């Protein structure tokens, strides 16, 4: 049976540490995204881009954080810039996971290099519903069918992210669950080219214990949710494979200030 003992309390404090860091590193939380998407917020109502006329009007009315004549490339470039920002936020989050900054720096880089796309699919789900995706820190909303309407190869770029999100969002995870789930993904001891695997697995084992407890406490209706989330971490591996294949097609078939 489950007991409230010193070990369980340490796992709750680890979970709370990760939640607080997650809130700090990712300003637009799932709770705030859901409130925007269900019209249950007093914050500013997002502008909806559902066709070319509303895109042209949105470019001018939505206030994008980034200063080609082709719509599909302008949108893909906005996508690229947002991913650079997300890599930074994810790296800031990783620095808060107990043990991570004490690992060999090369292994810190390798964990993040192979982890950030899995975490990007994960965090995009928080911003997605059946209709579309929140953009520009919640100031805009771009529809799933408008993205699908963009010419090849851009039209199929976001489709697998929506597909994943439909199934993932049905698990009804909250920010406390996601904080730990993302930390487990980052501390994957099977990334290619790691030098010192055991210390990574040691941290992951503690994170897995914390995740399991979080899901039992937070999800009374789903006894095997832990197993279901490990299944999603497995799915994200083959899905990122397909994402990087499509990124290479774009890099060599089509034409960020921090990158200089």
């Amino acid at each position: 049976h489950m007991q409230l003992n010193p070990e369980s309390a340490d796992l709750r404090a680890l979970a709370k540490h990760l939640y607080d860091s997650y809130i700090k590193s990712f300003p637009l939380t799932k709770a705030k995204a859901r409130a925007i998407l269900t019209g249950k917020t007093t914050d500013k109502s997002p502008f909806v881009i559902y066709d070319m006329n509303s895109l042209m009007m949105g470019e001018d009315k939505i206030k994008f954080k980034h200063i080609s004549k082709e719509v599909a490339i302008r949108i893909f470039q906005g996508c690229q810039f947002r991913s650079v920002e997300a890599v930074q936020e994810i790296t800031e989050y990783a620095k808060s996971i107990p043990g991570f900054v004490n690992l060999d720096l090369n292994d810190q880089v390798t964990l993040l290099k192979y982890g950030v796309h899995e975490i990007i699919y994960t965090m995009l789900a928080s911003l997605m519903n059946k209709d579309g995706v929140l953009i520009s820190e919640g100031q805009g909303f771009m529809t799933r069918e408008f993205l699908k309407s963009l010419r090849k190869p851009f039209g199929d770029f976001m489709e697998p992210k929506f597909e994943f999100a439909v199934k993932f969002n049905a698990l009804e995870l909250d920010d406390s669950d996601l904080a730990i789930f993302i930390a487990v993904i980052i501390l994957s001891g099977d990334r290619p080219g790691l030098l010192n695997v055991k210390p990574i697995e040691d941290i992951q084992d503690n994170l897995l214990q914390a995740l399991e407890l979080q899901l039992k406490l937070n999800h009374p209706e789903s006894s095997q949710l832990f197993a279901k989330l490990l299944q999603k971490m497995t799915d994200l591996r083959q899905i990122v494979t397909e994402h990087v294949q499509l990124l290479q097609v774009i890099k060599k078939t089509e034409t960020h200030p921090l990158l200089q």
Partner: peptide
Amino acid sequence: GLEAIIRKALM
């Protein structure tokens, strides 16, 4: 680029 941004963000 990805590695460069990670090393930048880690420092």
